[PDB]
Design a protein around this ligand. Sequence first.
Ligand code: LMT
Ligand code: LMT
Ligand code: LMT
Ligand code: LMT
Lengths: 262, 262, 262, 262, 262, 262, 262
Amino acid sequence: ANQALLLSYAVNIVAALAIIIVGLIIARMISNAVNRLMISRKIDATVADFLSALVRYGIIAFTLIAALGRVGVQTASVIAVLGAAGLAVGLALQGSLSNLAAGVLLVMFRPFRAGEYVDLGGVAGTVLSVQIFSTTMRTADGKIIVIPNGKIIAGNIINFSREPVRRNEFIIGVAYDSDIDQVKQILTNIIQSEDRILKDREMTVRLNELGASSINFVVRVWSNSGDLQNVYWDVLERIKREFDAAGISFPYPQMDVNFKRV
Amino acid sequence: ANQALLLSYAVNIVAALAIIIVGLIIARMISNAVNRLMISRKIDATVADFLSALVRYGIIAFTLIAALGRVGVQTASVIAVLGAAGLAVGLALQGSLSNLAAGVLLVMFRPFRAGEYVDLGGVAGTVLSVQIFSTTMRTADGKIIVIPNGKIIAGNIINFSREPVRRNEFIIGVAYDSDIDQVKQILTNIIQSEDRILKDREMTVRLNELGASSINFVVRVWSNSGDLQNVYWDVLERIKREFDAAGISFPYPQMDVNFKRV
Amino acid sequence: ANQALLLSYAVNIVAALAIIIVGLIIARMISNAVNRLMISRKIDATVADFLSALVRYGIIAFTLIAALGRVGVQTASVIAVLGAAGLAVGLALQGSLSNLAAGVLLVMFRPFRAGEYVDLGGVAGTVLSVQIFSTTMRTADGKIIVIPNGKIIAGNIINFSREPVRRNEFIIGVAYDSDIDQVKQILTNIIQSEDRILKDREMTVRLNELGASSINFVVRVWSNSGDLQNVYWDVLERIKREFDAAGISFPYPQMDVNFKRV
Amino acid sequence: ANQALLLSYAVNIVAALAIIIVGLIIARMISNAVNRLMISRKIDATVADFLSALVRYGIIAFTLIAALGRVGVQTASVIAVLGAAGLAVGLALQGSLSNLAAGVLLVMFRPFRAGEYVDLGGVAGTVLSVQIFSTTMRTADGKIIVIPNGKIIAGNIINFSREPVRRNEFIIGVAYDSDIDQVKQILTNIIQSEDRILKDREMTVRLNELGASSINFVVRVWSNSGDLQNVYWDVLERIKREFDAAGISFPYPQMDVNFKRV
Amino acid sequence: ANQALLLSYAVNIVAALAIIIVGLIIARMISNAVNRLMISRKIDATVADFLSALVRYGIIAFTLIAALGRVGVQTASVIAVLGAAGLAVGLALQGSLSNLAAGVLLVMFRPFRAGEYVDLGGVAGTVLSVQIFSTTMRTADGKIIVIPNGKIIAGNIINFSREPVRRNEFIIGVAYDSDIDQVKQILTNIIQSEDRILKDREMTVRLNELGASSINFVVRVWSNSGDLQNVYWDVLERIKREFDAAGISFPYPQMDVNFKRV
Amino acid sequence: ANQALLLSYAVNIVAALAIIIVGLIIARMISNAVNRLMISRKIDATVADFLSALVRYGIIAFTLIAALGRVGVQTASVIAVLGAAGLAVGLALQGSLSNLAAGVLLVMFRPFRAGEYVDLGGVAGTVLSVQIFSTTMRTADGKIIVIPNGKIIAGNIINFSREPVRRNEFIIGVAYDSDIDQVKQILTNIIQSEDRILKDREMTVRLNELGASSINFVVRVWSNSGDLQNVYWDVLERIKREFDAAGISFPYPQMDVNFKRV
Amino acid sequence: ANQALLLSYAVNIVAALAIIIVGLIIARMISNAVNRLMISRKIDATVADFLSALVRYGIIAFTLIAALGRVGVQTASVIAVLGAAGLAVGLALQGSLSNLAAGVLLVMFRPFRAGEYVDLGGVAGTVLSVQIFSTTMRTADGKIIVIPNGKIIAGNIINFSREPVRRNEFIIGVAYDSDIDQVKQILTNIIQSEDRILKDREMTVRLNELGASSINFVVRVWSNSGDLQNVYWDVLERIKREFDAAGISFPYPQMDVNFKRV
Ligand SMILES: CCCCCCCCCCCCO[C@@H]1O[C@H](CO)[C@@H](O[C@H]2O[C@H](CO)[C@@H](O)[C@H](O)[C@H]2O)[C@H](O)[C@H]1O
Ligand SMILES: CCCCCCCCCCCCO[C@@H]1O[C@H](CO)[C@@H](O[C@H]2O[C@H](CO)[C@@H](O)[C@H](O)[C@H]2O)[C@H](O)[C@H]1O
Ligand SMILES: CCCCCCCCCCCCO[C@@H]1O[C@H](CO)[C@@H](O[C@H]2O[C@H](CO)[C@@H](O)[C@H](O)[C@H]2O)[C@H](O)[C@H]1O
Ligand SMILES: CCCCCCCCCCCCO[C@@H]1O[C@H](CO)[C@@H](O[C@H]2O[C@H](CO)[C@@H](O)[C@H](O)[C@H]2O)[C@H](O)[C@H]1O
């Protein structure tokens, strides 16, 4: 019935609620101002949202410490409990944070961009988009692959499309009795008559290996990246036709058999 | 017999029990209110339950600190003991927390959905459901596979079903003496007469490799994802029948044998 | 000989021993009450025992801090020493704690149950029991395998027994000159006359591959999981007998030999 | 020459030495009492020695803090230095602690016991003893293998000896022209006349595969674990003899050769 | 209406804003001065920017602590909140920090430089540039590979271009009946007449292996790194021509066939 | 010119230097005494040196705290700086500490000793010495291998030399038409006449496998470890000679060829 | 206009700058003295530079704490900010610190030295130098390999050059009909007439294996490390010549062909 204490306790609860409200307002205002200030300085929008969220949650933590102190909770208790809750949220969000930073780095440095054909860690396909946590790519046969961004930046990135010009390599195996000069001359005429092969680049035509059943010639020629596959197919069909017309044999696997009738 | 101290000790125990009861009530009320507030803001229900549990356990920690302080335990002692107990519970729950966050991300971004055929880290099957800690899938032969969610989001996700259209590839090997133009013409007629092959897509028919015993042709054609397997089977049987009717040989493995009767 | 201090020191030692005794009693009582309260709420018994042990050891830590403070040890010293001892015990018990939580999750979500045939990380067998730290399984040839629970929940779980119906697949290779329609008709009659094959499921019989020495047909049929192996054996023996009666050849490996007598 | 301070300093040094001596005595006494109390409660002796060592070193830490405080070292300094020394000793002893806990678990749950034949992580042999840090096993050819206990409990444990009964499997390949009923009848008579094969268990004799050069029959029969190898050898020799007597051929690798004299 | 407190609160807010402004100014000035001082001492520019950023953010942290103390936030609260925000930013930036330090080390010690052909962890190509977080290289066929710097310095670095002189190795297989002295003499004449082979280096020509179908000779010769591939091709073609002119046979795979007409 | 303060500051510097000197002396004395006390108790010398170094550095830390407090540095500052320096030294020394503890364990438990032939993680050789951080072994062909001690104790240790007796195993393949009883009788006579084979051990001679071209017999016999290789060589040469004298064939790889002249 | 406070603030700033200057001077002096003292005690120069840098930065930290305290920053704030900056620098320098300690250990214990041929983790070459962070080696074909020191000390180190004497091993396969005594006698005469083979070492010449097409003899002989390759080549050529002169056949791969004209 002695209300002098009950009024003080209710007034402390009201002061705590008022501190909570004013602190949430001030946190939203200051975080929005810092976000607009970072966006005006051409900071990346994701980095700006991340730092603004950190500012907002820090001001809210100051507010919670002040209010819970008004209702008698000690500062060490609030700091320990907020640290435990933040550690739990951080353990939950750790992988997403790694993927988020990786996606910012991928958009910032552009090791690849949408439309390029890439090989990310052994999967290969055309990049479709880099998103907040993962990259989507479409394989040559139309499957969709989703890869987390952190796994992408942690590994090698092979970009098939970045270079305008790329090299074909042919390995032609001919019979051991084939005339070497005739083979080199025919392959040279074939790659010389192909307009899509760049003549200012290397145009290797060399005997390369003495194989088990055949001698292997290597042909290396450069082309624009959009012509590479068609040049490979056209040159291969021309090699087949010209070697057939010239009598140069493509050998079947060979075997000397030393007969013994026991 | 001097009860002035015993009454003070019993009154402190009663005050501690009252603080415990009122704190549990306030924790349940505030956590339920924060949960309803998050659900009204369209926060995901699992994220809302997680943050509400954090709020409830934090208020209960404040309550325990106040009560145990009433019975003479120091604030540093309660904080150290609650931190040890929370570290033990967190070590127990760490993997479940990772799987829980991963399941929220899988439901939120939908790299796959129920009914799609996917390949998650080398196992492949039709997704049945994403659950709180793990995803269930059924393989093509009817086995059930359970995969933890964190393992899924940490790896590549190959979605066979997301794209409406997908590509078949045939590798046909024919004898070296086969006429190349006749082979290409027959394969072109076969894929031209198949209505389920999309004519506005690529329809590759090229000589692709000079193999050991055969020259390999590659055929690449696109179809709707529901037609892919049936188109593969029908085109393959037609290739067999047409090549038999045209006299184009499918070669057995070849071997030149250079006989020597020693 | 001035005993006024010695009596105070002995009385402090007696007060410390009394605090130890009363604290152990209160810890046992409160932990038993919390355990019964959790068991009444249908909490899993292992989770209840774990949380009750945490409550008991925390109350004992408060008791030790109070008693050692009575004998003059400072609160920071007791907290540091108990933290070191708890860190040592936690390093000793870390793997057991992971296995314990994993076993609770396995019993709770039942990815598999006793009697089911499963494949856990490359070992396969019939589950016998999930125990507190490890699962026992018996392989098909009668070996016993013990697997820690944490290793099980961290990996893929392939359950062969969960689905009532499962699919057989046959790969039959026949000679290239075999009549395709006759082969498909014979295989269709065989799987049509088998009562244990489910006729409402897929019943694939397709030419599948042009192999090196043979054309391979694929047969896919569904059966109840208890009939799968017997259906495989019966259908395979019938395929052998019917193909022998019809004259359809199973080819030996083939080789074209181009003879050259040098 | 004013000795009033020098006497106080010497008396503080003497008080520190006395606190050290009395604390070492009390630590040894209390740790021995706690050890006897744990051994009386049937706690495992290694666990009891570990917890007793923790109690002894904790009491010695309290003693060192009190004594070094008597000679003017601050409590925070002693706690930081003892924490650094304990962290160094713990880094040195971490792997031994893991092996010690693993050895306690191995002795407690007996996944294997001495004399059993086991496969621990790809090495296999007869267990000789589980020791404090590592297990010794002897391989079939007499090599000794020492494995750390933590590596053992972290992996799969395959116990060949735990089950009284185990299964043999034979894969017999016979010529394609062999009569299937005659082969099954001969194998059935062989396993029917073998007394060490358990007749109440499965006795599979089925055609299992159409191989490249042969049709493979599978025979599966159960025996007592001590009879398994002898039953395998006896049944295999009987299969060889009976198939020779019946004219059933064991095929050499086959090859159809399509001759072409070019 | 009693404004004596409201004026004090507004004056504290103004003092906090003034401390913020002056602290940001002083932080920018001191960090710029420390950066110019480090650049004058020939510290690497990236290391200087990193340490200057650390100095600037530390002075800003002191400023925030002072200002938030002026508005009543406690020093422990500001330190805990800034530590949580810095831990979040550090978890986001950890991989970038590792790549940044690795790039500084790569530029500083030059294990490779732009234009050199290197093999970094199994990918090989010509280095194009070392950048702040990753290295770019172009493969021999024109693909671009991006590798994070930390992955590069953590692994082996094989530099094909650092040494002016490099060794070719030929493995020539000849028939078993070939005269060994004639083979060694022909190979010696070939490598003796090649001007691009360094005569002061090793010029090995030895029988090296008795293979299955042939005896293998090893030839090892050194050349300038720019001549290595051309010397390999020229010597190989000369070996083919000279062995053909001398009648030394390159053997096909051999097989003794013990005929048995059963 | 008012020297009353300057004298106090110089006297504090002198007191700090005196505390440093006396503390270094006391640290050396106490650490030497503790080292001699541990060596007298038969503690291993490396463990004694490690604990003595910990005692010495801890006393030096107390000395530094007292002296730097005399010159006005606060205890928290000295503890934080010494903790940072000790963390840096510990990060530098962590791997060496692991190897040091592992070497103590290897010398203490003797899984192997100098002169024994062992297999440590896939490398095999004769142990030469266990040193403070690594073990040296010489391979059979004379290469020296250095292995860090921690890598050794973390893995399996296969000791070829610990057991006096070891088992040879022969796999002899004979023609399918060979008489089984004659083969077993000849192998039994061979191993019966060899004095270095232990007759009280197992002397297995069983048909073991029906191979592709041969039936394989297994022979298992025990010998003293010093006789194992010589017994293997002598028994193998005797098997060759006796099977040649008895007409038992060692088969060449077999092939049934079904000729077809197309 | 009341300058009594402004003068006090300026005097505190001047006192902070003076403390900074005097502290930098004292830090440089004390660190140089400790470095000279360690170098005089034959401490390794890198270890001395590391510990001197730690001493210098610790004294600078004490100086910064005192100065920033003079300008009103609290000790806890300076310690937290310096700890964050030191944690950032330590995360940047962690891998370099591991490589630095590893390089000190490599120079100190000399598992290898410059000029020796070693195999470090699967790459092999002649060591050129051990540097502060990485080791350089040149491969046999002249490529340069850079390996971080920590990766080297963490793995096996195979030293080909440390032992003066090393063993060659020959595996000679001869025809099954070859006389065993004649083969052993010829190989024994060959290795007996070779002066560079050490006659006091093992000189094994034993039949070793009954292979598919040949019986394999093993020859093992020791030589000085500089003679090993030349002895291998000379003995191999002599084996070829002597076996040709004696009529001992080197077999081609064998095949029994059981002809069947179907
Ligand atoms: C009290 C502060 C509250 C707010 C901040 C919360 C922070 C929570 C931190 C949780 C512990 C982080 O512990 C982290 O674990 C990963 C495990 O791969 C390791 O570091 C990892 O970072 C990323 C994830 O961020 C991984 O993708 C990466 O493979 C690895 O480098 C380190 O061990 C440590 O960086
Ligand atoms: C006092 C606070 C009480 C409440 C909060 C309790 C927190 C308990 C934290 C326990 C330690 C966590 O330590 C964690 O270990 C894993 C080990 O893979 C690593 O981090 C890991 O996170 C997830 C699990 O959450 C793993 O699936 C992932 O592979 C890895 O990145 C880091 O090392 C660290 O994030
Ligand atoms: C309160 C201070 C605020 C400012 C400073 C912020 C620091 C943030 C530290 C986050 C935790 C770092 O935890 C780190 O995790 C990685 C995980 O591979 C491990 O260390 C790692 O360092 C680098 C990344 O820097 C990795 O490329 C490397 O593979 C590994 O050695 C260690 O576990 C620890 O160095
Ligand atoms: C302030 C105290 C100053 C004095 C004491 C200094 C201690 C310094 C500790 C540095 C951090 C140690 O962090 C350590 O990292 C290794 C990384 O494999 C892991 O533990 C490791 O221990 C040894 C090395 O000691 C490794 O061979 C082993 O593979 C692994 O178990 C743990 O993460 C942790 O034990």
